[PDB]
Design goal:
The chain is of the alpha/beta class and 306 residues long. It has 13 helices and 12 strands. Helix 1 crosses helix 9, helix 3 runs parallel beside helix 4 and helix 9 packs antiparallel against helix 10. The longest helix has 14 residues. The chain binds flavin mononucleotide and chloride ion (CL). The site of flavin mononucleotide has 20 residues, from helix 8. Interacts with EPRS1. Interacts (via DRBM domain) with PRKRA and EIF2AK2/PKR (via DRBM 1 domain).
């Protein structure tokens, strides 16, 4: 039945994840974080923002989660070592609701994949998932997914495109169905934005077009997070202010906030609001551009009071 926010570098930081939950996503994946950064990290409870932060040696917050999403956030790591991957899982397993391993390079070596994943399943008590592209040959694709399954992972997400297949090329619902059918564990359909998904109801269509257990949406949610809302799309302005509010409440860095709003604006980047956003050099300026200066001064004061 599940609507899932797909993992997305830069986009899937905490504000977007909360925003996606508000509009009706059941599960939110975070951006890919690399094991080699995460293993340098320290877990720190931030009583000011009421978040759990994981901080790097240069004092940067690498990953930030919070109570509202603790039963729904899936942590995705990029990794090519089973011992390193377990170490990262151990660091976060208490503050997250699942561990995902990216595979779209790693996809080449099935042995390494098998090692990493079984180490995680035996290693943590959270549902281990993974996300793959499809192989150029269907026989191999089917072989791959079956090896991956017996490692005891909770589910698998299939981006129905082959490595080095450009996004313009249609997603192959047919292979995702093949996969979904063969395996005993849930399959998560992925790859259907723009082509199949422009409106909420399109998601269940895609579910059926692929026989999958659920649907994982990226670009469509990046363009308008209210794509998870069954009642229909919200006006982009309303969504963007909602986004900014979260971003200010959780002290998001303004370059990240700006990046996400640009992905939302797109064509409308040439409106005066868009030009103001492009030009912003701080969160204050981002809020000004959307009539949220009041909100910014008010929320900043409560936060800087520790
Ligand atoms: C901005 C952006 C960043 C992405 N970052 C990641 C990432 O960190 N991890 C990942 O597994 N896939 C990443 N993806 C790919 C998506 O998760 C997904 O495979 C694909 O976009 C699904 O197709 P769809 O957009 O049609 O739903 C990214 C996609 C976009 C648009
Ligand atoms: Cl309305």
């Amino acid at each position: 039945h599940h609507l899932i926010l797909a993992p997305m570098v830069r986009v899937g930081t905490l504000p977007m994840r909360l925003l996606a939950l508000d509009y009706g996503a059941d599960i939110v994946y975070c951006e890919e974080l690399i094991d080699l950064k995460m293993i340098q990290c320290k877990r720190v409870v931030n009583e000011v923002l009421s978040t759990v932060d994981f901080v790097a040696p240069d004092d940067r917050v690498v990953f930030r989660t919070c109570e509202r999403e603790q039963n729904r956030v899936v942590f995705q790591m990029g990794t090519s070592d089973a011992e390193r991957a377990l170490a990262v899982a151990r660091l976060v397993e208490n503050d997250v609701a699942g561990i995902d391993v990216n595979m779209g390079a790693l996809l080449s070596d099935p042995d390494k994949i098998e090692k990493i994943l079984s180490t995680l399943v035996k290693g943590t008590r959270r549902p281990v998932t993974c996300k793959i592209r499809i192989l150029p040959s269907l026989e191999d694709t089917l072989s791959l997914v079956k090896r991956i399954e017996r490692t005891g992972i909770a589910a698998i997400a299939v981006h129905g495109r082959k490595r080095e297949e450009r996004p313009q090329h249609p997603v192959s619902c047919e292979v995702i169905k093949a996969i979904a059918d063969t395996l005993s564990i849930p399959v998560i359909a992925n790859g259907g934005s723009h082509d199949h998904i422009q409106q909420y109801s399109d998601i269940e269509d895609f579910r059926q077009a692929t026989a999958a257990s659920s649907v994982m949406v990226a670009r469509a949610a990046m363009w308008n997070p209210s794509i998870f809302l069954k009642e229909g799309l919200r006006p982009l302005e309303e969504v963007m202010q909602k986004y900014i509010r979260y971003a200010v409440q959780y002290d998001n860095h303004y370059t990240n906030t700006k990046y996400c709003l640009c992905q939302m604006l797109r064509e409308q980047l040439e409106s005066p609001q868009g030009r103001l956003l492009h030009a912003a050099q701080s969160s204050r300026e981002i809020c000004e551009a959307f009539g949220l200066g009041a909100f910014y001064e008010e929320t900043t004061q409560e936060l800087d009071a520790q």
